[PDB]
Amino acid sequence: SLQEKLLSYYRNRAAIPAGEQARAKQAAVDICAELRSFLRAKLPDMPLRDMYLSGSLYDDLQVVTADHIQLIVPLVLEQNLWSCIPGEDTIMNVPGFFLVRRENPEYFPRGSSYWDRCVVGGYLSPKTVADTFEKVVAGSINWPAIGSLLDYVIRPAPEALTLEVQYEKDKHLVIDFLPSVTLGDTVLVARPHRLAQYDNLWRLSLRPAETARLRALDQADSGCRSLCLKILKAICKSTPALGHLTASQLTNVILHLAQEEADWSPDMLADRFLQALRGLISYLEAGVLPSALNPKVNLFAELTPQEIDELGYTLYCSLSEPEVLLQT
Amino acid sequence: SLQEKLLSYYRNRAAIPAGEQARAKQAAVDICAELRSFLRAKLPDMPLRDMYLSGSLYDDLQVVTADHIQLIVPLVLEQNLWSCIPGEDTIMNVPGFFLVRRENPEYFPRGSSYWDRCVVGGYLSPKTVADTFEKVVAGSWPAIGSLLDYVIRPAPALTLEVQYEKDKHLVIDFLPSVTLGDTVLVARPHRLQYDNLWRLSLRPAETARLRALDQADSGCRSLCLKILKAICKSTPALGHLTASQLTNVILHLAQEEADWSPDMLADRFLQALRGLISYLEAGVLPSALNPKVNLFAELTPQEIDELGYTLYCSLSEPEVLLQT
Ligand SMILES: Nc1ncnc2c1ncn2[C@@H]1O[C@H](COP(=O)(O)OP(=O)(O)O)[C@@H](O)[C@H]1O
Ligand SMILES: Nc1ncnc2c1ncn2[C@@H]1O[C@H](COP(=O)(O)OP(=O)(O)O)[C@@H](O)[C@H]1O
C-alpha cells in the first residue's frame, strides 16, 4: 500500500538520524550563544539585537540530513523615522516585498539615525544593510577561532557569506545570516529578490506564520499535516529536477488543502499526500500559488514560466515512477 | 584552625546549595530569554539592545542564598548626538560618574533620537529613562511565569520577585545602561544627591580581573572574597560594605601578595581585614582599576566609624565573624 510505502519512506529517507540532528542543533545553539556574548559589548552605537536561530532545522521540519539553518540578525528601526511601502504599490510591482523609506528627513535630518549610513535615494536598501552587516559585524569576527573556542572546525565561505560548520566526521551545517527589521507587525528580511533590478526590495517574512499555522492545525486535529510536508520536502530535496520547489510552496499547498479537508488522521496520510501532489500540479498548471497567509502574494512569482512548466512536467512523469520518487 | 574555621565556614554558610543556585540562575536565564521574545515582537522600534544578566549570581560569586540578579537594559545612543562628561570635570566634582549630554540640539532637534524623550535640561536623565522603561517595557509577567512554572510578582521601583522554589525567591532588578565610545555607564545613582549622574560600570572589569588572577594560580582570591561577602551579609555592623569594596580590597592585596595557594587563606583573610581598617582610617578605598574613584565616597561617617570599630575588635577574635 501507499500508506506503508510513505511511512517506510519517511523513516528511511525523510527523517534525519537523531544523532546527526542533535549534533547539528547543538553547534548552532553554541555558535549563537558565543556570538551573543561576543557582540554584546562591541558595536555600542549600532541598534543591533541578539542573533537568533530560525529555519526548518530549528523547527524539526528539516529532512534527510541536517545541513543548514539561519541566524536572523535583528536590527532596530527607530519609532517614526521609517515606513514600509508594499511592493505592489511601488513601480517594482511585486507583492511580498516592501520598500523601506526614511521618514521625516526634513525634521530629523540625515545623520539622525545609525541607519542613515545605509540609506540610498531615500530608501533603506537591504543590500546596503547586508553589506554593512557583513563588513561591520560579521567582519569583526574570527570564524575559525570561535570554532576553536567551541570544539568545531568553522569555515567561512569566500560565493555568498555562509559558515560551514563541521559538527561530525563528515557532516557540516551551513549557516547564513538574514538581517531583519520590523515595522509595526510587518517583519522583513534581506533575502534579495532573484533579479538584480529588484534589489531595493526587502522580502516579507512568512515562515514563522506559515509554520505556526501548520503546527496549530496539527495540534488541534491531531493531523498528519507536518508528516506529509516532510515527506514532500524529502522528495523534492532528493530529486534534482524538483530543485526549484521550496518548503514555503509545499507548506502552502498543504495549508490550502486544509481548507478543503478537515480530516487528517494518521490513516488518511496516503490520500492527503496524493491530494497534495495533484494540488501542487494544478497550481503549477495555473502558474500561480497564492500564499495561504497573504493571497496577494504569488509564491511562484520568482520562477519563470519555463521553470514552472518543467516542474509540472517532472511531477506528471513521476506519477508513473513511484520507485524513483520514493528512493531510497 | 582559623584556617579550618574559614574553610568550613565557606562550605557551611557562604556557598549556596547547588540545587538552589542552579534553579535560581536558570530562572534568570529563562526569564532573560523570554524577554528577548517580547522585545522582538512588541518593541521593534525602541533602540534598545537585548537585555542580559549581570551580577554575582551569574558569576558564581553570590553567597548564602541565591536571592538577586540584575538585567542590564542597554540603550543605544547615536555617537554623533551624545557625549559623556566625566564627573570630575563638573562643578559637582564626582569622579566615577558621568553626565550624558545631548549634543548638537540646534541641528538635530528633539525627536532626532528616540532617547530625546528621556532628556531633561539637555541631559539624559536616568530617572526618566527608568520611568520610560517601566511604562513602555510594561506591556509584557504571569505568562512568562506560567510558561516557566515560576510565580512572578513585579513590584507596584519595578523589580521582579520570582518564586523559583517553595521557600526561596529571586529578585531581579533592571539597570539601564548606555555606552558611548569606550565608556560603559549604568543608572545606579550616587548613594550620598546628584541623580543626573550615571555611574561608570566597573563590575565587569573588576570581576574579570579577579577571575584571571585565580585562573592562572588556582588561587583563593575568590574564595576569600566570598567568605568576606558572607560575613558582611551575616553581620549587621559590617553590612555597609559592598561586594565591590571587598573585591577591590582583594585586588589591591593581590598586587602585594603573589602566593594565594590554599593554605594562605587565613593569612590573606587577616590581611584583608587590616586593609579594610587602613582604607577606613584614610576614608579612601581607591578603585584598583580607576584609582581616582574613591569607593568609600559613598559611605557615611557613621558607617565608617562602625566598620572600623567592628573590624578592630574582630582582629583579636576573628572567629567571632565565622558564626556557624
Ligand atoms: N524568519 C524568517 N523569515 C523569512 N524567511 C526565513 C526565516 N527563517 C528562514 N527563512 C528562509 O526559509 C527558507 C528555508 O526554508 P525552511 O522552512 O528552512 O525549509 P528547508 O528545510 O527546505 O530549508 C530560506 O529561504 C530562508 O531564507
Ligand atoms: N554591569 C554592571 N555594571 C555596574 N554595576 C553592576 C553591574 N551589574 C551589577 N551591578 C551592581 O553590582 C551590585 C551588586 O554587586 P554583586 O557583585 O552582585 O555583589 P552582591 O552579591 O553583594 O550583590 C549592585 O549595586 C548592582 O547594581
UniProtKB/Swiss-Prot annotation, chain B:
For molecular function, the Gene Ontology terms on record are: ADP binding; GDP binding; identical protein binding
Provide the residue span(s) of the region labelled Important for interaction with DNM1L: 27-36, 101-110
Superkingdom of origin organism: Eukaryota
Q: Which GO terms describe its cellular component?
A: mitochondrial outer membrane; mitochondrion
State what changing S56A does: Abolishes ADP binding
Localization, per the record, is: Mitochondrion outer membrane
Keyword line: Membrane, Mitochondrion, Mitochondrion outer membrane, Nucleotide-binding, Phosphoprotein, Transmembrane, Transmembrane helix
What membrane topology term does the record carry?
A: Single-pass membrane protein
Residues annotated for ADP binding in this entry: S54, S56, H68, S201, R203, K229
Principal localisation: mitochondrion
Per the record, ranges on the Cytoplasmic side are: 1-324
One biological process term in Gene Ontology: positive regulation of protein targeting to membrane
Role played: Mitochondrial outer membrane protein which regulates mitochondrial fission/fusion dynamics. Promotes the recruitment and association of the fission mediator dynamin-related protein 1 (DNM1L) to the mitochondrial surface independently of the mitochondrial fission FIS1 and MFF proteins. Regulates DNM1L GTPase activity and DNM1L oligomerization. Binds ADP and can also bind GDP, although with lower affinity. Does not bind CDP, UDP, ATP, AMP or GTP. Inhibits DNM1L GTPase activity in the absence of bound ADP.
Subunit info here reads:
Homodimer. Interacts with DNM1L.
Please give the family membership noted in the entry: Belongs to the MID49/MID51 family.
Q: Could you identify this protein by its name?
A: Mitochondrial dynamics protein MID51
**Organism, as annotated:** Mus musculus
Gene name tied to this protein: Mief1
Q: Span within the entire protein? A: 134 to 463 of 463
